[PDB]
With several copies, the nearest count.
Chain A
Amino acid sequence: RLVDPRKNFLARMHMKSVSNRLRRYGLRYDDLYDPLYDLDIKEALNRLPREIVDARNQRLMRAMDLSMKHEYLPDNLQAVQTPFRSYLQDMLALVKRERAEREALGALPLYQRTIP
């Protein structure tokens, strides 16, 4: 695929830019996934262990504090950041698979979004 960093150098530049932008705030890419965006994310987040969600929330608070202060992380802290270490994607995919299996057999959804 063209989105493969190993095969495509444009994807390599894209991944480098995204990683650098994430590292300035100490954010993981999975931290950008908001429960309010879809009920599948909300369900996947509810299925995760507590310490992971607490770490996510702490990173979110740190990033918000940095953004409000017009500041970036110190370089010593930036060196230890792992912007693309995942904690959410596999659980999200599992929740999607379970949702699709429910839909295929004619069952009601386990959760639905509120009509605004």
Chain B
Amino acid sequence: LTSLDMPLQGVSLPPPLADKVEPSKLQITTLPNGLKIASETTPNPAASIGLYVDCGSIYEAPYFHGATHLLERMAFKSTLNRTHFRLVREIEAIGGNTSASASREQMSYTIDALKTYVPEMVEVLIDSVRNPAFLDWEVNEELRKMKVEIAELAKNPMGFLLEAIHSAGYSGPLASPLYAPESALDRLNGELLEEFMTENFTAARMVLAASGVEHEELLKVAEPLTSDLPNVPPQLAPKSQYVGGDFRQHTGGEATHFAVAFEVPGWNNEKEAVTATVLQMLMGGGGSFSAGGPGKGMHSWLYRRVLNEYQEVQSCTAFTSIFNDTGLFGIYGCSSPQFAAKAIELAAKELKDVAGGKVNQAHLDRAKAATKSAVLMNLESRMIAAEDIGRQILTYGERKPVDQFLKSVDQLTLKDIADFTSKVISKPLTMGSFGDVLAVPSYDTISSKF
């Protein structure tokens, strides 16, 4: 043909889009069985359709340990109406991509394709979640690849520590592992998965959020496939109690790790969530294992203090894991196997320093701008937009505007940062270490620092 530097002759060019497009408004339709369908029209030619369920490992207790992550692996397999092979072929015929995510309190199933294939996407997604066949050979295959997915867990110190301190920080449902032990998997099978899914996957616990489709077409395709679902009355998620705790696996060798965490308010309580996010940005930090790209957190308190005043540190940053009614704010760290005590001292001192009020307004504005730009930028993505719609309609049912969050960020003073950090570290701490723990101090000594 012609070289790509010359325009192709005889091509029908569609008219250009306007430089200013009026945003669309979320439409939320509730079915009599309690299932909510939401969508927003989008100018780009991509559609993201997801199903979000308020099930998770907080429902496995006591007899379904490991069911959530197995269900995550068993997504988009053989249905009662279609084989796995046929379903993969239908997804690939329209250039689609599937994904499933499992959390302690939420599961999601998403498909992404061009917006002209919405009926196929909706049909394949509902068949998948409503009609799993749970064939024994498919379950056994996904269980072998679950053993690898759990054994390679020790290769991610941040993730391993995060789960470990979730286990050591709570007592009730939140303490149930999201990565079940190997003994807990020799019991799981197709009958168990079916019994678990039928109990928890109800219409009033499920949201169909579709970013990039007209609501009329989505309703026309999805209504005949979800109304059959019966009305199941709304139960209550179980309660979890935050306690203290220490996690310690002395493996020996080198390259110790740790994570000191405290309790923070959940997603409910909508002024302090923000105080936690802005705190996380304020401490900030970085992985300290790679570099490249200014503005990623090189001038936060954690970075500028540890990585610019004390060498031989392999990782140091802050994390956050907020649930509906509770959360975990903490600080990571790698250090060196004998430098561990000094590392924990540094971390505790930093928490105490922001607790007292040793942070100036310049850093507060810096962290505030970082929070606002992080939230606004992460909404550039269509995937994140759809997932946010689904999660927020599952949790609040409203999809609160981002502007309210932006004002709370810009209503934060130093007195707020100070009182919240003071409250957070006045409560029991969750300590977790992984590697060589012999030189790592005790739980009591670290607890006495705060």
Interface residues of A (CB under 8 A from B): 46-47, 49, 98, 101-102, 105, 107
Contacts and interface: CB of A to CB of B under 8 A. Distances in A.
B137 A101 contact: no
B136 A101 contact: no
Contacts of B137: 46-47
Contact of B136 (A47, A98, A102, A105): A47
Interface stretch (B83-91, B143-151, B312-320, B355-363): B83-91
Contacts of B89: 105, 107
Contacts, number: 14
Nearest to A49: B136
Contacts of B86: 101
A57 to B, nearest CB: 19
Interface in B101-156: 136-137
Contacts of A49: 136
14 contacts: A46-B137, A47-B136, A47-B137, A49-B136, A98-B83, A98-B85, A101-B83, A101-B85, A101-B86, A102-B85, A105-B85, A105-B89, A107-B85, A107-B89
Contacts of A107: 85, 89
Nearest to B93: A105
Contacts of B85: 98, 101-102, 105, 107
A51 to B, nearest CB: 13
Contacts of A105: 85, 89
Given A101-B83, A105-B89, 7 more contacts: A47-B136, A98-B83, A98-B85, A101-B85, A102-B85, A105-B85, A107-B85
Give the interface size class of chain B.
under 10
Contacts of B136: 47, 49
Contacts of A98: 83, 85
Contacts of A101: 83, 85-86
Nearest to A97: B83
Q: Which 3 pairs across A and B sit closest by C-beta, in order of nearness?
A: A47-B137, A105-B89, A98-B83
Nearest to B86: A101
Nearest to A107: B85
Interface in B306-345: none
Contacts of A47: 136-137
Interface in B76-101: 83, 85-86, 89
Contacts of B83: 98, 101
Contacts of A46: 137
Interface string B194-214: 000000000000000000000
Contacts of A102: 85
A94 to B, nearest CB: 10
Nearest to A46: B137
A88 to B, nearest CB: 15
A90 to B, nearest CB: 14
B158 to A, nearest CB: 34
Nearest to A102: B85
B82 to A, nearest CB: 10
Interface in B176-218: none
Interface in B40-90: 83, 85-86, 89
Interface string B245-261: 00000000000000000
B237 to A, nearest CB: 36
Nearest to B84: A98
A43 B155 CA distance: 36
A39 to B, nearest CB: 15
B191 to A, nearest CB: 11
A35 to B, nearest CB: 16
B199 to A, nearest CB: 24
B188 to A, nearest CB: 16
Nearest to A98: B83
Nearest to B88: A107
Nearest to A105: B89
A91 to B, nearest CB: 11
A103 to B, nearest CB: 11
Max chain B Cβ within 10 angstroms of own Cβ: one of A46, A49, A102: A102
